[PDB]
Amino acid sequence: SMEFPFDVDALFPERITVLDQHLRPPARTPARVDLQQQIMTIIDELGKASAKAQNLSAPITSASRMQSNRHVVYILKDSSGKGAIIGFIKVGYKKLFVLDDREAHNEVEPLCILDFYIHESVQRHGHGRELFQYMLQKERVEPHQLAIDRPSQKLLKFLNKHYNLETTVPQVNNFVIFEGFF
Ligand SMILES: CC(C)(COP(=O)(O)OP(=O)(O)OC[C@H]1O[C@@H](n2cnc3c(N)ncnc32)[C@H](O)[C@@H]1OP(=O)(O)O)[C@@H](O)C(=O)NCCC(=O)NCCS
Numbered sequence: 811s812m813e814f815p816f817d818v819d820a821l822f823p824e825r826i827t828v829l830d831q832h833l834r835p836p837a838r839t840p841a842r843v844d845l846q847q848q849i850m851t852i853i854d855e856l857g858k859a860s861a862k863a864q865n866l867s868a869p870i871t872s873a874s875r876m877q878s879n880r881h882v883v884y885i886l887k888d889s890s891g892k893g894a895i896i897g898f899i900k901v902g903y904k905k906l907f908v909l910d911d912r913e914a915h916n917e918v919e920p921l922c923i924l925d926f927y928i929h930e931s932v933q934r935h936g937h938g939r940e941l942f943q944y945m946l947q948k949e950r951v952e953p954h955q956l957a958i959d960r961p962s963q964k965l966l967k968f969l970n971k972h973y974n975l976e977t978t979v980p981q982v983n984n985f986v987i988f989e990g991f992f
Contacts, residue, residue: 811894811929812859814852818893821848826944827885829853831877849873853883856898860927864962871900871925881924884948886941888932896937897928899945906957909981910992921949922957922985926965939972954990961986 820839827836833853835845850873857871876883881902888894905919928938946953953973958965966986969975977989 811888811890811896811932812855813892813894814848814855816848816892818852818887818895819891820893821845821852822885822887822893825887825889826941827887828948829876829883829885831880833873833877852885852895853898856885856895856927857925859929860898860925863927863930864960870959871898876900884941884945886928886937895929896932897941898925899923899927899941900925901945901949904957906983906985908957908983908985908987908991909979911979911989916992918957920955920957920987920991921951922959923961923965924959938968942968942972954988956987957991958986960984 821835823836829849833846833849835842835849839845853871853873853876857869860871861869879902881900883898883900885898886896888896902922902924903919904922905917907915908918910916926938928941953969953975958969975988979987979989979991981987
């Protein structure tokens with residue numbers, strides 16, 4: 811997994827840390843601003859890593875952009891010194907126009923899966939599921955109520971395997987939604 815020039819276990823005492831625009835250092839140290847800089851560095855690097863893996867020319871996730879856009883990120887640390895980071899999922903509500911099965915446009919504002927990444931060295935070990943499930947439970951949203959931003963084939967296979975999400979409603983934007991969404 812991905813390691814950092816500082817102590818991740820101390821920064822993130824919980825296995826899954828939930829952060830929003832205020833980037834609050836979790837309850838216990840270095841000064842608060844220094845801990846926030848650590849968190850920024852982690853999000854910046856997670857976003858970079860997710861970006862390469864997706865053939866992205868630019869990351870969709872960074873510390874500054876998460877703050878400005880008021881997204882929420884769930885970061886999973888490694889349980890296997892100084893700790894390391896396994897991956898993350900980034901979510902947010904977006905106002906969308908979405909097509910239904912009747913090819914009719916609909917104004918909706920669902921919870922969106924905006925970025926999702928698990929370190930390559932530890933994929934297909936069930937970490938993505940654990941993280942996704944945690945997010946669902948915290949957000950109080952059902953999987954079929956989600957919109958997915960530009961999913962990979964991997965993520966589509968994932969959503970089928972773990973949540974029986976298979977049948978999609980064809981869109982012209984770059985979001986995917988499932989039967990059940992409406
Ligand atoms: C998508 C991702 C978050 C899944 O997390 P994960 O920790 O690998 O997932 P889990 O181990 O909980 O679930 C594994 C399931 O995901 C799917 N999956 C994961 N890696 C896969 C691969 N290389 N090929 C095909 N399916 C894959 C499969 O359904 C797999 O089940 P299987 O092993 O029974 O085939 C992770 O693979 C990833 O980071 N991918 C790279 C970037 C990306 O595409 N994600 C962003 C979506 S746009």
